[PDB]
Amino acid sequence: ELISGGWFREEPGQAMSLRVEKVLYDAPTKFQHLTIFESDPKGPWGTVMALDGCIQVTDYDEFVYHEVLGHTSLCSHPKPERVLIIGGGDGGVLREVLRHGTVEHCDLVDIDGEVMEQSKQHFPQISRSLADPRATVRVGDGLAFVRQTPDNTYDVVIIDTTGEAFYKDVLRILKPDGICCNQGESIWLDLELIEKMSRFIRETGFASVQYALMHVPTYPCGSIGTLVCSKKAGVDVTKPLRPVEDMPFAKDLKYYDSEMHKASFALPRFARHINN
Amino acid sequence: GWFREENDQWPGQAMSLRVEKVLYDAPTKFQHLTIFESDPKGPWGTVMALDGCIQVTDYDEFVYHEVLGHTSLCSHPKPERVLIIGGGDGGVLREVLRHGTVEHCDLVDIDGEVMEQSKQHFPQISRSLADPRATVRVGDGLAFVRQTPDNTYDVVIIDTTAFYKDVLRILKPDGICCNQGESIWLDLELIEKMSRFIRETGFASVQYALMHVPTYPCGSIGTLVCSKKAGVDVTKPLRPVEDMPFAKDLKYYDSEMHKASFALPRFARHINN
């Protein structure tokens, strides 16, 4: 029950407010509250999607997190043929993955079928990937999906979502050269959580884990990062194995390139122990 | 009990912080100055705004002060005399003073009430103001540079809320000017203009360095790093901070972050080529 002309508010002791031009969807789903609106056309954001009160997608900045997740992982892999995306119901990470000609197939599993339906309706430049015949899009819980996946199925697993048994399944379903990249977390709000997850994922049996920081302006404090995790040892994910500049789509990307890839693993000194 | 930030140039958008206690709120001869204690449940601590725009918080002031102070002084072969225009809070100056090469720093800020309030409410920032190697002037930086001799400064840092020709003129041959330089998300066209304008004034190279500033609108800002002498690749450090004894005291800046900060998203990269 957002109203056109009203203001959408996101909140300890800080709030962000964006004026609403047209409400497109606002209702609880089976799993979470989903809000989609056209923002004030006098500002840059365009259409906005929020999940339980928190902006997840906007027209203006959607490309950052999708390009970074899709390319930092696939450009770290020698031949990414088969890819899994867990979450990603909006289609953005999938759109990026499908740019890569080496990809033969990509499975995507998101628990909330209404997010994909609403992204098809109101974010066609993000969600058009979901109709690709190289993609199999499924509605289900990713926890159960990886539990039921055979050993050695995927070259790359991306976890684009909003436990010890889960990560051991991710490690087991990846092939020997496997690369995983995981949910965004903030060096400003979540530093302790990042340092724990990084230790835990190495302990689980990944050979290396490096955090890649990116400039997402609509995420709280304006950055987020992903842990890029290599199953095999001797792999340096911080310098691209397969530079995107050698691929025919590089000029179409709005954020990512090789210079940003190498830059993203440089952290502010207070966080640098995450990576060394 | 909320401070609300919203600027006419970015319509239908706002950021707000809960106010625990108001410390100061008055116009000044030049601008509106607001200082408050923010919610103790949150990280920001004490907050200073000027004309309704947050300029400093206890929590993240290190980022903008380290980037400005160290990107510029680490890009200079031997920075002995430094000018700061603005910076009445003391933060750039505190960073500039870490450097053993610096013999003297002049700091010229138009607003004396800023410095006064900063000594009162931000002592861990404004202690620098009392340093024997600094001279602090209340006054317009536009007038100050006009009345400064050619070839006076190694580094000019413009930390603010004909002029550039004067900055170019007062810098020695190998001089570096660094200026606060706007958001790639909300003012990218202003950065393009400024970059071209400074280059045509006669700086030989101008490069934009991006940094993560969590209390700034959309979480980032950058500075334009400008060299009078050509061939000067500012984007790699000439005096790496790691060879200096205060390197581990820093909370944000090091040489990996220096190099990284000049890598721009593809949509903004035409600022640097």
Ligand SMILES: C[S@@H](CCCN)C[C@H]1O[C@@H](n2cnc3c(N)ncnc32)[C@H](O)[C@@H]1O
């Ligand atoms: C919209 S997407 C985040 C925006 C960046 N593209 C986050 C999705 O993760 C899904 N999600 C959350 N938990 C799960 C599980 N357990 N399984 C699959 N998908 C999940 C949720 O439905 C969102 O659509």
Ligand SMILES: C[S@@H](CCCN)C[C@H]1O[C@@H](n2cnc3c(N)ncnc32)[C@H](O)[C@@H]1O
């Ligand atoms: C607070 S500082 C903000 C950045 C975080 N250190 C911005 C300062 O610039 C001063 N300022 C503004 N205009 C001028 C001029 N024209 N000259 C000098 N100082 C100036 C102003 O009073 C602020 O303290």
Ligand SMILES: Cc1ccc(COc2cccc3nc(N)nc(N)c23)cc1
């Ligand atoms: C003073 C000022 C702050 C931010 C901005 C632009 O930014 C935003 C605006 C509104 C809502 C936002 N909500 C989220 N999540 N993120 C943002 N960056 C948001 C402009 C001006």
